[PDB]
């Protein structure tokens, strides 16, 4: 419960709104108790009085009380849910700005060890779980504690030994039953998360490798192992439901003991006098009605275990140290950029094999280089060093004869324009999908670039207001690729890094995109990484990579003139 | 829209419940007993309280009603605990049975159909969506039985005592749904106005969280915080208009809950004083009758209040049912299974006549294929991408169904039992996987009990032992993207070692030593060129050089083997192979 502190300071903001929602939970829940307690006493007072004594008995005041207490538990409950949910959405803005801000400095490298497909889905879920701490834990628990005190103080006027024996019972099961059930379900909840992700890991291996398993006779063997994890996984789910059953049966037995004690103890005497009469039903119906306060407390141990798991999971992700750090030198962006690498060596954080092994190349100003290699040769790991996603361990990288580690992040992002191998289409409009490249560009500047990169159908029937994304219009792989190049054109950085720009495209659009590369960014230092051979004659100083190191380097003519991998690549030897 | 569909989904949900109909019956039966004990415990307090308050009976004379009251409380706690367990065991029983049906369909369909969707998409259907059905059978279905059996028992129990107290409760029975409908009319318009934007704003945080690399390379990280800030105030402002009408509809039940308790107190309280003289049966109104109605007044609406909190479990089970129904109703033609067994372990003879390789969805992947590969001879498939080379290899593996004739030693492949046929089969395909946990368990996938000498001879032959020292734990190091990632050429030599561990009859090589570095390509093709001479072999390669030794070359175009012959004959003679050999190579 020490892991909730970083996220409880985000609840400090909008506390006057969180506190109001808890206050309305007291008022709603005291009116529920007051309505049944007053009704139980009103029935007893009227029956004891009887018909003889109609005029003597003041029945308009209790009848006004039951009317008032009924209105303030329906209106109170309505505004309790409104304020509680409004205050929850206000914090959710704080929990997501906080989570996003901590994940930016470590976006490429801090998240690489995981499966980004199911990690970011888990980060969204964990932020939602942390957002339901007040709704599921704080409000039911704090709301019940204040209600019990008010009931205990209110009943103390009638009788002290009966108020503290009902308030004491309610305060005991508020203070020691949630800790006891959270403590009992701590191991099962951890076993249940371990076994769920183990089943997912074993199922993905069994489905992905179904061709290998089927022919080598291991598919039945590996499904028994998969179905054994499910049995353990379901056993952990059963043990979690045995606590849900046992916690609801113990709340029912405690609330029974409070009813029994009030019937027995208040029968002997309420206050000074024996034969209390109507006051017997005031205590019995208070014990009967006051355990609605403790009803939400019953499940709060299960929710608090989930929030602590999410708080630890988010904290372990956002509290790691960033891979790279940027000096705040505040330099000016150079007009022309010449890139130099010397003995650049890189190993990923946990791997024991080098990804780059002594790569040293030189790119002069206005020069178009093409890095040429197979799959996995480490060419995408080379461009991530230029964008400073990672740091080389035994090499040096220079931009304009000055080390790349001496550039402030604002200057580095304005010096290098990169089109990624995986283009991201944000959910926003087509205008906001291009304004990230250059925020200050006019709507006419964005229009001409789209018409300059061959995206003229995008301007049809909606213009720049077309919503592209999860719910909007999707873009084809070739139509998405021109958007990545459209962004690079808007950025107008001196150095352009293209990772497999013509990848998965038909030769008709591949040639014109590559033609688009040469004519537009002709005065720019261009470093293209690719595994294709088309249009490489345009580039000077073709560089061939293999297994993380350069094996051959020269222009298109020289590489063919001498027998080598490029000549083998072209020939297909 | 699609209401005719949503009714069919709920129709599907009740079909799966037959699996544990026994436990749905016990929960239905225990919810009736749970309502009997609510009346019994309200009757014992009503009779106990009347004796103390009106007759001034000492508590020591009330031991028998107290004992029956304690027992009714203990029994009522046992039923609650028993209903939670019976409800879970019911819901878990559907999930176990359905997950077995889903995996049986996926195993039966085989790798031909599994490769259509990402493995993450299959994990969602098996883990996320099958689990989404639990609360429908564990909580919602038992509660709907409880939401009708209990409130009808309070009305039946109060009616003999007082028909006005029972009419107060029964009077709200048709008024609550009538008012929820009126609010649902207003809430529908607000929901429709805000539906498009809310679903659009739902994925905003995840879409800025994905593609956070792009926000980094452009320096838009700080400018996206103001985007997340603005999309969180817009989401809240839209989702509170929905909630202002949703909590109004939810508060209809809470309005009549207190109006009933208020009317029960006022009616009974005024009845005792003599203000009202209508409700009772002219026998006089007792204090026990008022206590019985007042204790049972909040219990009348409690089952309906829990059903509101379990109602979400129905919408999330219908969505799960939607996808689980489409998965289990697809036609999905699958390869036919026989029971014949191959005679010998000697190299097999493959021969086809008008073969037609068919996709699981019925689409033909390769046209009429006519060929004959004699026993012990290695063939090679060449052709442009999409020609249908892998489809032919998959059909030989039994992963695809074929219309024509495909005979192994004269026995049709459909006649052959898959379990025994795959024992005579080995293969090394493109994008090969390593399902096992470690590097040792992957090489020994074919035979896990092979001794160290058999394993060491396999690693040495495939040149796996040369990159083992680079790995942390040697042979035992776990392999994967999460543990000790192997290079593409290193993981291909593990697939070669795994395939060459056991002597096979037919070896199917699909683009081996493609997208490998120079050293692994030499080592992979060193072991595979030696292993293609010990049995009948079929290799698929885009590299047309150094095919002189291979016994026969098949050229495929649009699912048709158009040119067959040796490398020497096909090279000189103009034809489709000559065009391929002279063709420029588009990519590495
Ligand atoms: N996050 C990572 N952790 C460990 N190893 C990694 C990671 N990312 C990549 N690698 C490995 O680094 C090596 C080079 O990968 P990479 O730089 O992506 O090559 P590439 O030439 O860009 N491949 P491709 O995208 O298919 O064209 C391979 O062994 C990868 O599997
Ligand atoms: N299971 C399948 N369902 C539907 N279409 C398929 C399936 N398998 C293959 N295809 C398609 O059928 C055509 C031939 O595929 P296939 O025979 O696997 O090609 P290939 O010759 O292996 N291609 P390549 O290795 O890239 O040169 C292509 O359109 C494939 O995408
Ligand atoms: Mg790459
Ligand atoms: Mg293929």
């Amino acid at each position: 419960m020490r892991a909730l502190l970083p996220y409880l300071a985000l609840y400090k903001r909008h506390k006057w709104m969180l506190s109001l929602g808890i206050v309305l939970a007291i008022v709603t829940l005291l009116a529920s108790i007051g309505l049944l307690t007053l009704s139980g006493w009103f029935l007893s007072a009227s029956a004891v009085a009887g018909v003889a004594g109609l005029y003597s008995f003041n029945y308009m005041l209790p009848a006004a009380g039951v009317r008032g207490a009924a209105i303030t538990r329906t209106a109170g409950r309505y505004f309790e849910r409104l304020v509680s949910h409004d205050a929850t959405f206000r914090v959710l803005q704080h929990l997501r700005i906080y989570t996003f801000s901590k994940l930016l400095p470590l976006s490429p490298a801090g998240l690489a060890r995981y499966r980004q497909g199911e990690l970011l889905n888990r980060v969204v879920a964990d932020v939602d779980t942390l957002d339901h701490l007040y709704l599921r834990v704080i409000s039911p628990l704090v709301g019940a504690f204040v209600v019990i005190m008010v009931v205990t103080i209110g009943l103390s006027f009638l009788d002290f030994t009966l108020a503290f024996t009902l308030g004491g019972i309610m305060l005991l099961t508020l203070f020691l039953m949630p800790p006891l059930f959270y403590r009992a379900g701590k191991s099962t909840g951890q076993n249940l998360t371990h076994l769920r992700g183990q089943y997912r890991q074993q199922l993905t291996a069994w489905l992905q490798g179904q061709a290998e398993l089927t022919i080598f006779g291991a598919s039945d063997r590996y499904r028994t192992q998969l179905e054994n994890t499910e049995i353990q996984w379901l056993e952990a789910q059963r043990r979690q439901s045995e606590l849900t059953a046992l916690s609801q049966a113990i709340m029912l037995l405690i609330g029974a003991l409070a009813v029994i004690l009030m019937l027995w103890m208040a029968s002997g005497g309420v206050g000074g006098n024996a034969q209390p009469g109507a006051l017997i039903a005031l205590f019995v119906f208070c014990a009967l009605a006051a355990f609605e306060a403790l009803a939400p407390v019953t499940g709060a141990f299960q929710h608090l275990g989930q929030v602590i798991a999410s708080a630890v999971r988010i904290s372990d992700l956002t509290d790691q140290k960033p891979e790279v750090t940027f000096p705040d030198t505040q330099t000016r962006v150079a007009d022309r950029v010449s890139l130099t690498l010397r003995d650049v060596q890189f190993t990923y954080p946990e791997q024991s094999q080098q990804a780059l092994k002594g790569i040293s190349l030189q790119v002069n100003a206005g020069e178009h280089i093409a890095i040429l290699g197979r799959t996995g040769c480490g060419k995408s790991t080379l461009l991530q060093q230029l964008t400073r996603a990672w740091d080389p361990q035994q090499g040096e990288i220079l931009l304009n004869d000055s080390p790349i580690a001496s550039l402030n992040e604002a200057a580095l992002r304005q010096t290098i324009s990169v089109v990624p191998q995986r283009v991201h289409l944000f959910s926003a409009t087509l205008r906001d999908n291009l304004l990230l490249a250059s925020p200050g560009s006019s709507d006419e500047a964005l229009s001409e670039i789209l018409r300059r990169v061959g995206l003229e159908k995008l301007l049809e029937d909606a213009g720049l207001n077309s919503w592209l994304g999860e719910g909007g219009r999707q873009l084809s792989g070739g139509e998405l690729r021109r958007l990545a190049i459209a962004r690079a054109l808007l950025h107008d950085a001196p150095l352009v890094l293209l990772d497999e720009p013509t990848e998965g495209l038909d030769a008709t659009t591949e040639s014109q995109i590559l033609e688009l590369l040469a004519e537009m960014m002709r005065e720019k230092t261009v470093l293209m990484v690719t595994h294709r051979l088309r249009g490489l004659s345009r580039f000077q100083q073709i560089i061939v990579m293999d297994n993380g190191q350069i094996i051959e380097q020269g222009t298109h003519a020289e590489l063919l003139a001498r027998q080598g991998r490029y000549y083998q690549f072209k020939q297909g030897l | 829209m699609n209401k005719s569909r949503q009714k069919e989904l709920t129709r599907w949900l009740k079909q799966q419940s037959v699996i544990s109909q026994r436990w749905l019956n016990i929960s239905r039966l225990l919810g009736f007993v749970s309502g009997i004990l609510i009346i019994a415990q309200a009757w014992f307090m009503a009779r106990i309280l009347q004796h103390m308050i009106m007759e001034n009976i000492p508590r020591e004379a009330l031991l028998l009603p107290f004992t029956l009251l304690v027992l009714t409380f203990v029994l009522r706690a046992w039923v609650v605990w028993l209903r939670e367990r019976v409800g879970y065991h019911a819901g878990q029983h559907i999930r176990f049975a359905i997950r077995r049906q889903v995996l049986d369909r996926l195993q039966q369909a085989g790798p031909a159909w599994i490769q259509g969707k990402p493995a993450g998409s299959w994990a969602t259907l098996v883990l996320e969506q099958i689990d989404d059905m639990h609360d429908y059978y564990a909580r919602y279905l038992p509660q709907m039985a409880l939401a009708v059996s209990v409130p009808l028992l309070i009305v039946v129990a109060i009616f003999p005592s007082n028909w006005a107290a029972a009419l107060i409760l029964l009077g709200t029975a048709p008024l609550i749904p009538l008012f929820m409908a009126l609010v649902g009319m207003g809430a529908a318009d607000a929901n429709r106005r805000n539906f498009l934007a809310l679903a659009r704003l739902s994925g905003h945080f995840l879409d800025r969280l994905r593609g956070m690399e792009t926000l980094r390379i452009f320096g838009r990280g700080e400018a996206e915080i103001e985007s997340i800030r603005s999309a969180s105030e817009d989401f809240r402002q839209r989702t509170m208009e929905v909630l202002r009408l949703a909590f109004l509809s939810s508060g209809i039940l809470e309005f009549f809950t207190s109006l009933s308790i208020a009317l029960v107190a006022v009616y009974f309280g005024f009845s005792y004083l003599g203000e009202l003289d209508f409700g009772h049966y002219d026998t006089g109104v007792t204090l026990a009758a008022g206590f019985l109605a007042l204790i049972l007044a909040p219990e009348f609406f409690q089952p309906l209040r829990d059903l509101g909190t379990f109602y979400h479990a129905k919408a999330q089970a219908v969505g799960a049912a939607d996808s689980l129904k489409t998965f289990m109703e697809t036609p999905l033609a699958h390869p036919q299974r026989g029971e014949a067994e191959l005679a010998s372990t000697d190299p097999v003879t493959i021969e086809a006549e008008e073969l037609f390789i068919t996709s699981p969805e019925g689409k033909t992947l390769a046209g009429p294929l006519n060929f004959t590969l004699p026993a012990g001879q290695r063939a090679v498939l060449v052709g442009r991408s999409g020609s249908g080379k892998s489809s032919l290899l998959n059909a030989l593996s039994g992963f695809l169904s074929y219309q024509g004739s495909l005979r192994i030693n004269g026995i049709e492949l459909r006649d052959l039992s898959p379990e025994s046929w795959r024992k005579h089969l080995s293969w090394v395909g493109q994008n090969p996987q390593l399902p096992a946990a470690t590097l040792r368990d992957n090489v020994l996938l074919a035979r896990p009990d092979a001794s160290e000498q058999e394993l060491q001879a396999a690693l040495d032959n495939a040149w796996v032992s040369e990159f083992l020292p680079l790995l942390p734990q040697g042979v035992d190091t776990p392999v994967g993207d999460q543990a000790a990632r192997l290079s593409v050429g290193q993981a291909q030599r593990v697939a070669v070692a795994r395939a060459l561990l056991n002597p096979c009859s037919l070896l199917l090589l699909d683009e081996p030593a493609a997208s490998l570095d120079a050293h692994s390509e030499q080592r992979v093709m060193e072991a595979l060129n030696a292993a293609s001479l010990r049995q009948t072999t079929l290799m698929v390669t885009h590299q047309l050089e150094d095919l002189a030794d291979w016994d026969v070359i098949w050229v495929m175009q649009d699912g048709r083997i158009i040119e067959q012959g040796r490398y020497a004959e096909l090279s000189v003679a103009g034809g489709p192979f000559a065009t391929l050999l002279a063709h420029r190579q588009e990519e590495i």
Side-chain angles (χ1 to χ4, degrees), chain A residues 44 74 78 93 96 113 115 212 215 223 230 264 351-353 374 387 424 427 531 533 572, chain B residues 59 104 107 207 216 232 244 258 291 422 427 433 470 482 485 490 516 521 585-588:
Chain A
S44 305
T74 76
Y78 176 70
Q93 165 180 169
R96 294 192 296 183
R113 76 212 51 219
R115 295 68 64 89
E212 289 81 19
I215 285 174
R223 190 185 175 184
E230 190 211 8
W264 186 266
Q351 310 310 320
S352 58
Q353 304 204 54
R374 287 262 171 82
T387 80
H424 189 67
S427 179
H531 59 109
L533 298 172
Chain B
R59 63 196 178 187
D104 275 16
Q107 203 190 34
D207 201 14
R216 187 208 95 213
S232 285
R244 274 201 261 290
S258 43
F291 282 153
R422 271 71 171 268
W427 62 271
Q433 307 282 319
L470 321 183
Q482 303 294 110
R485 294 172 78 127
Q490 282 170 0
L516 301 198
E521 172 164 334
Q585 303 224 29
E586 293 179 353
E587 81 159 17
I588 291 171

Side-chain angles (χ1 to χ4, degrees), chain B residues 112 359-361 363 365 384-391 400 430:
Chain B
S359 183
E361 283 88 25
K363 209 199 96 161
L365 307 179
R384 51 154 182 264
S385 163
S387 160
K389 297 175 302 315
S390 291
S391 292
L400 289 172
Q430 38 184 194

Side-chain angles (χ1 to χ4, degrees), chain A residues 26 57 70 72 111-112 114 137 145 177 200 205 212 266 285 290 328 340 375 378 424 435 470 485 545 548:
Chain A
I26 319 289
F57 182 73
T72 180
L111 293 78
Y114 313 110
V137 180
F145 169 76
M177 192 186 88
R200 196 189 209 105
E212 289 81 19
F285 278 86
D328 43 29
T340 291
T375 297
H424 189 67
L435 282 183
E470 303 198 12
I485 307 176
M545 258 197 61

